Amino acid sequence: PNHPLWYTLCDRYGLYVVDEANIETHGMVPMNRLTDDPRWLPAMSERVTRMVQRDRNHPSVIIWSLGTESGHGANHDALYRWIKSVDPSRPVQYEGGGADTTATDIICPMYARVDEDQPFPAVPKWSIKKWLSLPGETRPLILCEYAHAMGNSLGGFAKYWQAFRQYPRLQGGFVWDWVDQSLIKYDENGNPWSAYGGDFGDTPNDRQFCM
Amino acid sequence: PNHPLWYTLCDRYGLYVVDEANIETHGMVPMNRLTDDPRWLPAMSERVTRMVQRDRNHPSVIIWSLGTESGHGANHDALYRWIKSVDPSRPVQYEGGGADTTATDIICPMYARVDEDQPFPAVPKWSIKKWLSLPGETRPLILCEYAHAMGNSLGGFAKYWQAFRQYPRLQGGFVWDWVDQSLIKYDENGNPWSAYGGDFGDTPNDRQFCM
Numbered sequence: 001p002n003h004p005l006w007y008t009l010c011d012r013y014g015l016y017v018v019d020e021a022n023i024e025t026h027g028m029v030p031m032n033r034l035t036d037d038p039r040w041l042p043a044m045s046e047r048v049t050r051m052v053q054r055d056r057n058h059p060s061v062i063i064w065s066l067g068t069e070s071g072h073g074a075n076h077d078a079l080y081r082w083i084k085s086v087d088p089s090r091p092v093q094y095e096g097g098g099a100d101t102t103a104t105d106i107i108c109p110m111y112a113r114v115d116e117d118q119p120f121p122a123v124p125k126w127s128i129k130k131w132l133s134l135p136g137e138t139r140p141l142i143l144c145e146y147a148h149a150m151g152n153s154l155g156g157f158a159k160y161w162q163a164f165r166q167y168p169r170l171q172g173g174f175v176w177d178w179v180d181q182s183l184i185k186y187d188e189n190g191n192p193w194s195a196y197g198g199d200f201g202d203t204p205n206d207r208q209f210c211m
Numbered sequence: 212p213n214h215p216l217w218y219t220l221c222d223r224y225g226l227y228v229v230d231e232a233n234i235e236t237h238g239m240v241p242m243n244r245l246t247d248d249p250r251w252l253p254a255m256s257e258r259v260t261r262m263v264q265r266d267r268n269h270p271s272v273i274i275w276s277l278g279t280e281s282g283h284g285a286n287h288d289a290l291y292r293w294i295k296s297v298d299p300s301r302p303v304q305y306e307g308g309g310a311d312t313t314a315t316d317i318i319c320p321m322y323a324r325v326d327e328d329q330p331f332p333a334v335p336k337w338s339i340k341k342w343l344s345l346p347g348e349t350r351p352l353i354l355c356e357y358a359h360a361m362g363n364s365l366g367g368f369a370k371y372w373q374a375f376r377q378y379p380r381l382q383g384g385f386v387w388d389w390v391d392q393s394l395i396k397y398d399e400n401g402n403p404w405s406a407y408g409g410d411f412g413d414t415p416n417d418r419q420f421c422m
């Protein structure tokens with residue numbers, strides 16, 4: 001959840017908002033080790049329920065999100081249902097566990113390509129065009145992360161948009177991401193320079209991946 | 212409906228058959244002028260019912276077809292329900308009236324393209340990839356006619372088969388068609404040659420479109 005003033009500003013200028021619970025357990029092995037564990041349910045619930053209680057009156061918030069990159073646990077299913085019950089006014093989405101689990105109203109893959117399948121074991125990323133038409137699937141598809149803009153990037157961006165326009169059920173996506181996460185450091189003359197991971201003696205690190 | 216020996220031979224050699232009733236009114240304006248008219252229902256029914264009564268025991272017959280190119284009329288709807296009622300063992304298909312009407316179990320267009328939309332009024336031929344994921348659609352798609360093999364033809368044939376393999380609900384189609392409809396004429400010195408429309412004094416004619 002963002003600084004409270006952000007929602008105000010989005011109400012007034014006009015932007016659609018995905019409001020997301022503070023839940024990400026990426027580094028667990030496997031990814032759902034905590035979110036499938038009922039002993040971590042109360043801790044998780046407070047991060048979803050308190051977001052809904054604070055933010056439920058802003059018109060700019062149109063979709064609720066259960067977090068990100070935490071696999072798919074039974075805690076997600078319970079919390080998905082909690083939201084659908086106290087606030088029917090907004091769809092709920094969540095990406096973990098293959099983008100199309102029983103915990104999401106919207107097929108929300110990350111980095112799924114337009115025409116090319118990436119058939120990973122257990123959690124494949126199908127081409128988005130193919131994904132809509134998988135036997136028995138009916139939901140809309142909106143990428144929660146796509147077109148990773150790291151460095152000299154964004155090649156093939158046109159290809160997504162040609163598809164978004166041609167397919168009614170392909171309803172677009174959220175580019176990753178807005179602003180470089182670099183920090184300021186100074187030399188011996190007082191000149192500032194932009195820094196990434198590693199530049200503070202911080203280790204282990206992931207270098208330029210923060211930009 | 213074919214020569215009765217055809218079905219026996221398909222049973223024994225192993226071929227899937229689409230048995231099709233003797234109804235085509237392509238030349239009416241509009242195409243469904245008779246098939247929507249209740250006074251032509253008796254003549255139509257006899258052509259569907261007498262087919263099902265004759266061929267219903269052949270295992271090679273897997274699909275029933277209501278005819279071809281007669282637009283979409285209420286008589287197609289009645290006769291569709293008649294078949295489903297007397298023989299639940301087999302799906303019923305019909306291409307006329309846009310290829311996805313209430314008178315077909317299978318989306319079965321003729322000459323719809325792989326990637327390219329052809330948005331004709333009322334009877335659009337969508338790209339087969341797009342057609343599957345239209346809002347509310349769930350049916351399998353098999354082209355009743357595709358890859359028109361007239362003269363030096365069959366360009367772009369690989370593009371269909373690449374799509375057939377990648378998309379589960381795209382399940383193939385039937386090439387148009389098997390054999391050239393030319394006839395033998397003889398000249399002054401008694402040598403045979405292959406003839407097409409017009410070559411008999413026949414007028415009006417459609418020249419080589421029979422090949």
Ligand code: NA
Nearest residue numbers: 164167168170
């Ligand atoms: Na769209």
Ligand code: NA
Nearest residue numbers: 208209210211
């Ligand atoms: Na990053």
Ligand code: NA
Nearest residue numbers: 375378379381
């Ligand atoms: Na297929």
Ligand code: NA
Nearest residue numbers: 419420421422
């Ligand atoms: Na022809």
